[PDB]
Amino acid sequence: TQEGVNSKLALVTKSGKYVLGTKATLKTIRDGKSKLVIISSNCPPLERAKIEYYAVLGKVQVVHYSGSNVDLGTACGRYFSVSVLSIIDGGDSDIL
RNA sequence: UUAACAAAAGUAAAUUCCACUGAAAUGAAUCAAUCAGAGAAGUGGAAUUUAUUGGCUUUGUAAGAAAUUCAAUG
Numbered sequence: 224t225q226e227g228v229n230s231k232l233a234l235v236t237k238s239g240k241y242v243l244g245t246k247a248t249l250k251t252i253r254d255g256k257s258k259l260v261i262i263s264s265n266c267p268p269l270e271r272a273k274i275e276y277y278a279v280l281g282k283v284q285v286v287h288y289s290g291s292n293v294d295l296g297t298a299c300g301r302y303f304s305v306s307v308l309s310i311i312d313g314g315d316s317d318i319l
Numbered sequence: 320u321u322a323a324c325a326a327a328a329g330u331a332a333a334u335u336c337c338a339c340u341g342a343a344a345u346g347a348a349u350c351a352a353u354c355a356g357a358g359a360a361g362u363g364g365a366a367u368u369u370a371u372u373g374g375c376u377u378u379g380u381a382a383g384a385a386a387u388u389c390a391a392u393g
Contacts, residue, residue: 244356247341270357292357302343306357 225289228261229298231316236300238314243299245270248307252277258319259310260285263292266306274307286318 235241242251245266251257252274260278262271262285278285288295296305313319 242341242356244341244358246358247356267357296356301356302345303356303358308356 228286228288228318231318232261232298232308233300234315235310235313235318239316240311240314241299242309242311243296243301243305245274245307248274248309249277251309251311252281252283256311257281257283257309258312259283261288261295261308261310262286263288263290263295263306265291270306 232241242248248257248260252260257278260274260283262274264287266274275285288298290298292304292306295308296303299305299308310318
């Protein structure tokens with residue numbers, strides 16, 4: 224069903240604010256800026272387990288992206304790969 | 320001109336890690352390459368290697384030695 228969230232993460236790039244990177248995602252979960260976490264399908268199972276446990280503590284929803292980190296980076300209009308992603312605010316979409 | 324073994328005034332090259340921050344107008348770099356959101360470059364650090372301690376100069380050793388001269392041992 225990857226004709227949805229892919230288009231959802233296109234208005235966020237235009238109006239909303241997200242942050243790319245596992246280290247930078249963990250920074251936002253520690254604060255209150257995180258409102259949603261998207262994890263690719265190939266994130267290492269040990270670093271993935273640390274994001275979810277952090278999100279469970281922070282009560283932030285985790286969206287298991289159906290593509291790899293290469294596909295997730297392209298979904299944000301980026302020429303590198305993104306493993307984890309945090310949404311500070313949804314611009315015009317309905318992701319949150 | 321200077322040894323083994325040790326010292327630590329001064330000071331190198333290369334690689335790998337750590338902290339801050341988060342790269343797109345993509346940058347960084349080599350003779351060649353090669354690398355980066357499971358995170359580049361920047362700044363500040365840590366470690367190891369470099370014919371023994373710690374690589375080079377320097378120092379103790381150690382000038383009393385040795386080399387080159389002079390005089391009839393100095």
